Curated annotation (Swiss-Prot), chains A, B, C:
Pathology linked to this chain's protein: Immunodeficiency 61: An X-linked recessive primary immunologic disorder characterized by recurrent infections due to impaired antibody production. Affected individuals have normal numbers of circulating B and T cells, but B cells have an intrinsic defect in antibody production. Disease severity is variable and onset is in early childhood.
Residue numbers of the full-length protein present here: 594 to 665 of 665
Localization per Swiss-Prot or TrEMBL: Cytoplasm; Cytoplasm, Cytoskeleton; Cytoplasmic vesicle membrane; Synapse, Synaptosome
Protein name: SH3 domain-containing kinase-binding protein 1
Highest taxon, organism lineage: Eukaryota
Gene (UniProt): SH3KBP1
Bilayer-crossing regions: none
Source organism of the structure: Homo sapiens
Coiled coil: 12-74
């Protein structure tokens, strides 16, 4: 059972130990979210970098065609 | 020390205060994960948008070359 | 009120029920972070796949122009 307290409204032994254990899990969770954000952010950066390099090649190709079009239209 | 309860199996004072403090941290964690997901999702959207615009330029370049190839193959 | 314990330093009833409920929330949080990481990772994969296919088309366009340039420079 979990998240139950309707049929039980009285204190029990190991109350301090229970809270101490729960406190540790709470902090561990915050660390998980932080690390997860860093990992996801890293992947995003790599994706943007790839798109950047890709644009560089396309720009060069455009110039090559621009020269051919000029002469193709000439005379 | 943290997450300890083997050498301690008895209740202590401030039991209600301890739980109240732990409850606040639990909720704060859920909010962190939610916000983190939104931030990561935003970055993903921007990446897809960039790739979209990039494809638009490439398509235009393809048409320019298609015209030159036709005449290059003619006669 | 939440995260309060300065004006209260004494145990109360339902101490076991309070900890049991808090424990459930702690575990639920860990699951949220895990699922969130998977969702974000999926989106990243799709973005990389799109960039990959885009590069394939650009490469083909480059070859088409390379042939036209050769003849354009000839004679």
């Amino acid at each position: 059972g979990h998240m139950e307290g309707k049929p039980k409204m009285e204190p029990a032994a190991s109350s301090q130990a229970a809270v101490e254990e729960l406190r540790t899990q709470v902090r561990e969770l915050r660390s998980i979210i932080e690390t997860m954000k860093d990992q996801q952010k890293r992947e995003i950066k790599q994706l943007l970098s790839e798109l950047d390099e890709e644009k560089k090649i396309r720009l060069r190709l455009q110039m090559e065609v621009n020269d051919i079009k000029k002469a193709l239209q000439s005379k």
